[PDB]
Amino acid sequence: ADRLKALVDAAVQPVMKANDIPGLAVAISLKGEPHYFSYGLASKEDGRRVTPETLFEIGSVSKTFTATLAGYALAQDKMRLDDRASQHWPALQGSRFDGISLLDLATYTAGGLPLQFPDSVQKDQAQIRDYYRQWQPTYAPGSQRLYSNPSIGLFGYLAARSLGQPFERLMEQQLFPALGLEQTHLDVPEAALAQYAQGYGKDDRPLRVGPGPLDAEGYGVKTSAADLLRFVDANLHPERLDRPWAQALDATHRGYYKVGDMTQGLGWEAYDWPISLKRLQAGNSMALQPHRIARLPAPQALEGQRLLNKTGSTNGFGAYVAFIPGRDLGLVILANRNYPNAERVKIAYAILSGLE
Ligand SMILES: *[B@@]1([O])OC2=C(C([O])=O)[C]=[C][C]=C2[C][C]1[N]C(=O)[C][C]1[C][C][C]([N][C][C][N])[C][C]1
């Protein structure tokens, strides 16, 4: 307990001072035991302290939840990864999505869908439909990875359509309950708002995420360190869940291609373990520009001596999740500042190394 807190303090405290992080929550799953380390302030203005129940925006860590709902649709044979995208939304039939697979959308290889929807696209069903209807690939589907909200957002929306209900309803009514997540929200209840940390940007501008097209699919989850560790433990032990949910989690542990040291799954990104900190930082700090992929001859099991991870950022928050299946080791780092991905990995690496 002294060694473990000293290890986590040594990793966290300098990174919080260097990046002026007001509050940070750590959760570690070690050999099936949870450990929580809470630092600093959820809100500077009233001095509310971070706890393991504080809600943080996890940004693009939401994509691993989106991938899990798609895994659930696969498990129920409502869809297949080699389906043409437009088979799941009649509004897209006759568009370029006639020639793009669900796997291409899930893995950012549809042919140049951008990082974000253009500002001209509001959170509006018609605007989003018309955006996709008019879109044309810049390059061949299946050839270049460009990290993209509209890409995996559409994957998530099409998975929900395949299940016959809206995305946000499936998450609240089926997925969060199935995984035992009662402190995980797309739309934070009025009664839980007291737990919602403040985000801090430039000059400590207060920042909580506003509405955007396919926000729920791309970046919309708010959760606690305790709940996000529950999600990690479900990923470490899919076999403990009812069969369809065990399968949905397994679908997110399959690699399709490599870019540098990274193997791309559905939501999760994987590295061999051990690997240098510099390489794990570089993987998580990629130039937001297109990368040629190396396609695997068959989908690869993402298990054993590998680190699976995901970064997530909003204007006010910075999240990182990592787990090593072969070591039954999981960690969550949630902060209320969008501090650099390399600094998030720096904390995590110090902890995971400390425990190897
Ligand atoms: B997501 O968090 O992944 C991501 C990272 C990362 O992996 O850490 C870094 C940089 C960008 C992204 C994209 C994802 N996050 C967002 O899209 C943030 C979101 C974008 C829309 C904003 N509101 C628009 C204003 N009308 C809010 C922040």
Provide the domain limits for residue 289.
2-80+166-354
Ligand 1 atom 20: residue of nearest CA: 314
Residue 111 covered by a domain:
no
Residue 137 covered by a domain:
no
Instruction: Using alpha carbons, select from 79, 32, 75 the residue that is nearest to residue 242.
Output: 75
Ligand 1 atom 6: residue of nearest CA: 312
Per the CB < 8 A criterion, the answer to whether 1 and 9 are in contact is: no
Residue 102 covered by a domain:
no
- Residue 306, classed as helix, strand or coil, is strand
The amino acid sitting at 194 is A
Per the CB < 8 A criterion, the answer to whether 132 and 95 are in contact is: yes
What CA–CA distance (Å, rounded) separates 48 from 25? 13
Residue 240 covered by a domain:
yes
What CA–CA distance (Å, rounded) separates 152 from 240? 27
For ligand 1, mutation pick of 116, 223, 333 (most atoms within 8 Å of CB):
116
Residue 32 covered by a domain:
yes
Burial 289-298 (b: 16+ CB within 10 A, else e): ebbebeeeee
Residue 299 forms beta bridges with which residues?
A: none
Q: Locate tokens 């291409």: which residue?
A: 104
Residue 149 covered by a domain:
no
Q: Looking at beta carbons, which pairs linking 81-86 to residues 24 or more positions away fall under 8 Å?
A: 81/106, 85/110, 85/154, 85/158
Residue 283 covered by a domain:
yes
Which strands form 222-223's sheet, in the order they lie side by side?
A: 56-57, 222-223, 184-185
CB atoms within 10 A of CB 326: 11
117, containing H or E segment: none
The number of domains in the chain is 1
**What residues act catalytically?**
60, 147
**The domain spanning residue 10 has which CATH number?**
3.40.710.10
Residue 120 covered by a domain:
no
Technique employed here was: X-ray
